[PDB]
């Protein structure tokens, strides 16, 4: 038993590391829904949102912040599957990733490349979700295909990695139970401290607004440089309050922070909202998605779009 | 008195973190904000200036927008010494002075790396291609970053040229930051014998003139057979000829070689990828590979029959 | 027992001492100083080869096993991945 | 045994330059040692 106890204690040890996650009011965990085109990223997110917030987002665009627990929130981002640059930057910020694999077809380039990019910029928590399994006509080939895929997913990701299997889509929704099963896993995930993420400040644009005066757009022309405000939640190390901080935007260039101000939380977590062993109350569950259509209203630029004797 | 060393280090980290939280509780909310800044989890407004006109116009909500703070080293530009390899699943080895779309930190850019070898650690010698199945030292110009930062490289990012092959071309880690390199290329001079007297021999075509021979008097020279020799003196007549004494008699068909080295420089090329600023956002194109360039102009790969 | 009853040991890579050594694939090239996570006692270990020295870098977790005299230990995994597996390019080291 | 197959690849031999085709086959250390040893045999016997 002493030899056994020595070995188990051996595995427990790790390299000491500092996790800069704040002790109060942590940001939501960034969930990157990455997969080849047409695997079912959108239907997954819609299924993943519904189990939490009880409301379908008919259209999803940009990050989607949803409450998942009494003191837990998640930000869902689909990776643009046809852009490589989009896979690179999401890999550097996604705390959790949902990996869509077409079971009938098998693995693709766009999948493993993200794994190698993720392997090369800091492996985050990696979860495989298998889809299009209803296309199989025989159970024997389905089980064999499942075995081959899960074992190969164990080569890229630690052996015994959790891999989910989804059969089909009904009303743009996956089966509830398998969609419910993944709920418990994501809720209990703890995330290892990453060197890159815990040393620099970063924040994902929840919404986009141009603050340039329309008159300047006319008297000089559209060519004129634009004053812009970008909103979102901060991650990593704290951002210094004084303006002038140097910051990079992927695919854009390096800019300096002209102004910084804190706003109250658009999606207050349940333990926080009520503050201002018990199950999450369904009122507390909330969804905040500026760019996406939540309910029936979609806002783009300055025009807003909604879906819907006396008549005379 | 802690049982294992590990928890001691954990105890020190926790003690500092516990120390940190105590005083921020002591600082006022505004005073805390002035000191720590905006902690993670805060919903904040960032206002930017001189943002290019194409960003707001060519805004696709489907494409994410990511902001990342830059440390002082990230701002500085210079030569980055990197240990790099062709990705195992990449079909083809990389080439020196060949564009490579490279991701350091929060930024992606295209550069012209120089792949090099230590020559068993006498000198940094330029290498023409990446080793097939091992790392190699790589030098390129660009923004600096702290050492030990992993990175990745790609040759093609546009959808049009994606094809079926693996696009991850190179993988590596940065080891040093400085603003030059002293890469060198090995340059050998080849001369030919025309008169032989046992060990002593007269060589020709090594040098155009005795101007050159005088500088290289006494220099080490060898033949393809491995017989070592020296440049003893330049013959007055004809111009360029010199006498050499060799370890053993050389034959007329022998080729004598003088080994020498010529410095090489790193090209200062930078082309950041700005896909979001483009309407397509998926057809970003930069410097082309040497192979595609020859195809466009319809040129065969250079070759030498003697080689 | 070298590890006090255990078959393997964790450590943190401090420095590759022979990195400056001239002769390729040398025994001095081959040594890396590792600090055991159990007790803070700094020790040295053997790698598989100068190619496999190249995967290992400072501040990464390494699994040690019993093996220039004075060095009794061999590194078998780095960051939870087998060095031999990396050497055969059968796996990629996680950062 | 830790040497890969690729590490043990053949390094091929070059030949005489075409311009120098008239001067004879381009010799190598392996060919040179044959002439060197045989010349030494000549000198040793001539010496005795």
């Amino acid at each position: 038993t002493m030899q056994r106890s020595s070995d188990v204690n051996e595995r427990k040890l790790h390299v000491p590391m500092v996790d800069r996650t704040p002790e109060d009011d942590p940001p939501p965990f960034i969930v990157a829904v990455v997969g080849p085109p047409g695997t079912g990223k959108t239907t997954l997110i819609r299924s993943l949102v519904r189990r939490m917030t009880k409301s379908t987002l008919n259209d999803i665009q940009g990050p989607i912040t949803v409450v998942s627990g009494k003191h837990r929130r998640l930000t869902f981002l689909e990776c643009p599957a046809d852009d490589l640059n989009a896979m690179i930057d999401i890999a550097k910020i996604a705390d959790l990733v949902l990996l869509l694999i077409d079971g009938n077809f098998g693995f693709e380039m766009e999948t493993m490349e993200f794994l190698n990019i993720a392997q090369h910029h800091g492996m985050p928590r990696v979860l495989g979700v298998a889809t299009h399994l209803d296309l199989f006509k025989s159970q024997s080939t389905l089980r064999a295909s499942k075995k081959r895929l899960k074992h190969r997913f164990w080569t890229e990701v630690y052996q015994g990695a959790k891999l989910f299997y989804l059969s089909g889509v009904i009303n743009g929704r996956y089966p509830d139970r398998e969609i419910l099963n993944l709920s418990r896993f994501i809720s209990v995930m703890k995330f290892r401290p990453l060197k890159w993420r815990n040393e620099h400040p970063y924040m994902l644009a929840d919404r986009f607004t141009d603050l340039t005066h329309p008159e300047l757009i006319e008297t000089q022309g559209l060519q004129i440089d634009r004053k812009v405000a970008i909103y979102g939640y901060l991650h990593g190390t704290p951002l210094p309050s004084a303006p002038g901080t140097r910051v990079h935007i992927a695919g854009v260039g390096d800019f300096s922070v002209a102004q910084i101000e804190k706003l109250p939380d658009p999606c207050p977590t349940p333990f926080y909202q009520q503050k201002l062993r018990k199950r999450l109350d369904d009122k507390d569950k909330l969804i905040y998605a500026p760019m996406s259509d939540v309910g029936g209203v979609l806002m783009d630029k300055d025009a807003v779009y909604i879906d819907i004797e006396g008549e005379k | 008195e802690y049982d294992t060393w590990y928890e001691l280090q954990k105890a020190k980290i926790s003690k500092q973190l516990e120390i940190n939280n105590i005083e921020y509780q002591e600082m006022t909310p505004e005073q805390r904000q002035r000191i720590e800044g905006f902690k993670a989890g805060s919903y904040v407004r960032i206002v930017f200036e001189k943002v290019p006109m194409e960003f707001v116009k060519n805004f696709n909500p489907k494409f994410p927008i990511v902001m990342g703070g830059l440390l002082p080293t990230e701002i500085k530009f210079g030569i980055v010494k990197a240990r790099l390899r062709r990705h195992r699943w990449h079909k083809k080895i990389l080439k020196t002075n060949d564009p490579l779309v490279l991701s350091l930190g929060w930024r992606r850019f295209q550069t012209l790396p120089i792949y090099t070898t230590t020559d068993s650690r006498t000198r940094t010698r330029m290498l023409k291609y990446t080793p097939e199945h091992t790392y190699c030292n790589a030098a390129f110009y660009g923004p600096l970053c702290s050492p030990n930062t992993p990175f990745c490289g790609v040759q093609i990012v546009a959808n049009s040229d994606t094809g079926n092959g693996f696009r991850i071309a190179a993988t590596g880690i940065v080891e040093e930051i400085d603003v030059n390199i002293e890469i060198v290329k090995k340059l050998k001079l080849v001369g030919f014998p025309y008169k032989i007297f046992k060990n002593t021999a007269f060589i020709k075509d090594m040098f155009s003139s005795a101007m050159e021979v005088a500088r290289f008097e006494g220099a080490q020279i060898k033949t393809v057979s491995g017989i070592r020799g020296e440049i003893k003196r330049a013959l007055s007549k004809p111009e360029g000829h010199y006498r050499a004494a060799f370890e053993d008699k050389i034959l007329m068909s022998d080729i004598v070689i003088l080994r020498s080295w010529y410095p090489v420089r790193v090209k200062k090329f930078y082309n950041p990828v700005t896909s979001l600023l483009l309407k397509e956002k998926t057809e970003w194109k930069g410097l082309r590979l040497t192979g595609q360039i020859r195809a466009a102009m319809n040129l065969e790969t250079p070759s030498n029959p003697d080689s | 027992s070298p590890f006090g009853g255990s078959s393997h040991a964790k450590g943190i890579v401090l420095e590759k001492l022979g990195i400056e050594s001239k002769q390729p694939n040398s025994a001095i090239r081959k040594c890396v100083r590792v600090q055991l996570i159990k007790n803070g006692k700094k020790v040295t270990a053997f790698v598989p080869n100068d190619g496999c020295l190249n995967f290992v870098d400072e501040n990464d977790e390494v699994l040690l096993a019993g093996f220039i005299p004075g060095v009794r230990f061999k590194v078998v995994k780095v960051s939870g991945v087998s060095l031999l597996a990396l050497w055969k390019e059968k796996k990629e080291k996680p950062r | 045994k830790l040497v890969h197959d690729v590490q043990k690849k053949q390094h091929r031999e070059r030949s005489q330059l075409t311009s120098r085709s008239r001067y004879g086959f381009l010799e190598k250390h392996k060919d040179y040692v044959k002439r060197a040893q045989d010349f030494h045999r000549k000198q040793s016997t001539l010496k005795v």
Binding site: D82 | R88, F166 | - | -
Partner: peptide
């Protein structure tokens, strides 16, 4: 749009020594 994995990625045989065919059976 869909691009499948090649033989090298489907096996990850890596770099192995050449082995004689009598070894198969």
């Amino acid at each position: 749009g869909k691009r499948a994995i090649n033989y090298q990625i489907l096996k990850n045989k890596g770099l192995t020594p050449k082995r004689n065919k009598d070894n198969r059976n």
